[PDB]
Design a protein around this nucleic acid. Sequence first.
RNA 1: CCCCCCCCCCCCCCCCCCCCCCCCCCCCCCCCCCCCCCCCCCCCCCCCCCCCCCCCCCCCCCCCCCCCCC
Lengths: 375, 375
Amino acid sequence: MALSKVKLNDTLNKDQLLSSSKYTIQRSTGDSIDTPNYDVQKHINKLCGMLLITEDANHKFTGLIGMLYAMSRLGREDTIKILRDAGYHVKANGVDVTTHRQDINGKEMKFEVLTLASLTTEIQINIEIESRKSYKKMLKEMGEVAPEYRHDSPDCGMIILCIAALVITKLAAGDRSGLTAVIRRANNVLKNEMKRYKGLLPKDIANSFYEVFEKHPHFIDVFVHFGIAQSSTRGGSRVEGIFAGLFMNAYGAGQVMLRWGVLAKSVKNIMLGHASVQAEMEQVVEVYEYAQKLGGEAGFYHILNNPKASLLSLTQFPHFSSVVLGNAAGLGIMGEYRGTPRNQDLYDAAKAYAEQLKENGVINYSVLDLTAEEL
Amino acid sequence: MALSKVKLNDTLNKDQLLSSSKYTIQRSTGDSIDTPNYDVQKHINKLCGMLLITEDANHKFTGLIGMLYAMSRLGREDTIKILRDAGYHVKANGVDVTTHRQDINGKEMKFEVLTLASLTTEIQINIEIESRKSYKKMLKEMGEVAPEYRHDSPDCGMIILCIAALVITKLAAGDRSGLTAVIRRANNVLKNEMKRYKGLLPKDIANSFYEVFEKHPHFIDVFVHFGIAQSSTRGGSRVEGIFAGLFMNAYGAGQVMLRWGVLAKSVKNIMLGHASVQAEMEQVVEVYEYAQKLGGEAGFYHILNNPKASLLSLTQFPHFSSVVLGNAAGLGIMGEYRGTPRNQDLYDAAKAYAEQLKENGVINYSVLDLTAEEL
RNA sequence: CCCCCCCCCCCCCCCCCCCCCCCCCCCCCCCCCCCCCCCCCCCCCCCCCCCCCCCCCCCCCCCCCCCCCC
């Protein structure tokens, strides 16, 4: 009564503080940023395809080029708007298509290029040159190139942005450690696409995206909001359906510990009753309700580096964290997860009880009632 | 009390996120799209009939031509409006009827053709040429062609869109695997129509529609909304009544697992009481209520590739999925369904109990009460 | 008719306060796993069948009200 009413709400107080700032910072991203408009979108897709048909393609620029497609889907105005909302000063760079004349192999030739701050009109033609090589070879092998194999396929842009989504998936750890997991999934999920494109090398493109995200961290914001806008969509090609699916696997990255909590509660893991865990409960509810209040935007807080994500940490509660992680251990869901319990005794006990849980399913008859049962 | 209040609502949080995007993407469909207006509709229907009276007809273009009829029913303005709503930039292409003069067999002839981006005025006349051949042969066989046998019949357009609807039915799996099922149904349901049209070859047209949907995936959106607008209708010919019926068989494709859930609950399958299934319940209700909240539009989420459809998956709950699928097994409704239980022990137990359920119907007397019963 | 007695009120004491006392002080970023989805089957309907039918206006008597006292 007396003392049981004394508490301090820290998790929600902190949100309230960061939510109600009366002033703002603004960052100076760099000297330029290219904001391709809707009108350029088809050409960027075409360029993406050129990379995908190129066998053993150099994927250095592919990360950056993917970002360009995504921005050309958002559109010049929408893309700037999302940059400004994030708070960065934007030197917007208009993107037009111009023809370039250059003699390759002696003979003078025409090329379709983009005016880009980020991409030399030199390294652009080099992608188209290399693509043609892998294309005439492709034409020699099958006599006639099918539409699913060409750089025209409307899927090309989105196909590249698929391994981008997979990169976002594992971006929670912040380092390149997700890479092998990214490849693995790209191989099962995307196996059909990899059959139609010799240049769909997961390792390489995944590295190129990691690269662009690490280097230009504002793009990670841009991409997240693109994916959201792409998943808002009413219908779409199976590839866009794949993209959206993969993109959404990243919702709630960094907060795995949170879901394994709901699990511990769901399976009624005994070690949740422990006195020293019960002591933490008052606050552990505070954070779960804060997660609830936050809603949808919250899932991506860890992928973008949103300071407010620190608040969802269950790390601050060692006893609870430990039994939750032990529960997940004993149910064989963790590993090769690199989280450590701060309480070995609790972790072990939770693991032990969890392991015993899968052994006996007891039928509970009071969930569904029947007025006459012979059995 | 304490811990039982802690939960995270993930299914609804995710919807909330995709519903409330502040930005949008837009796709560049291709170079052109033909948007036939109401005024051309009768001519397209006529062209459809020409294909239907042609014995052993080449159905390569029939898929695309069907889409044109549907668009000519929606009307130029309504059809563009649905494309823009889906988010695609539209190069609208006006469709006029012009006369073409060409010498076939030496003699010069007139033809009624459409100005179409998608269809050469060459391959158009070829359908009318082939139709005439099968028509004069038809005239020779029965002396005089009845109105139900000609290419004039107002049904022709809608008849073709019938196997289109059937293609939508099985589009849930995404591949051509529905094809044999599509044929089967076209044969029972449409047997009367197949009698009046030698050119109503299900396999061929079904393949042509699969073709157009796979190739131009925006058409699948257009067709879905056409069918909705066609089923909104107040009255109509028996064929339009067949179309609507078939079209609506596709409502809830991809969500069969969901209906088999409601079934498991309905038959009071015992394995729903199991501890490890009860553990999932809290969340499995979340998704069913999300389905409820979504309402009508939800049924087609899987057919169009609407990212939000991933959310209706009961896959995320292995224990529940397994007993639901086992229940459906034991009641002999699954197969040749290619879904797999993630819990063999539960699936087997549910199947076993389900098989035992059909054996004994016990009369429950407390649903209807009577103040005096001698028996 | 109503009405009819008596009758001002008040009257003491009293400022209030007065002590002690800043506060603070440790630790600690976070994160880390796996995983697209989907896949069966199925148009709907289908019987019988207009309705209605009788009787039947309503009404009818008695009667102003009031009247004392103060």
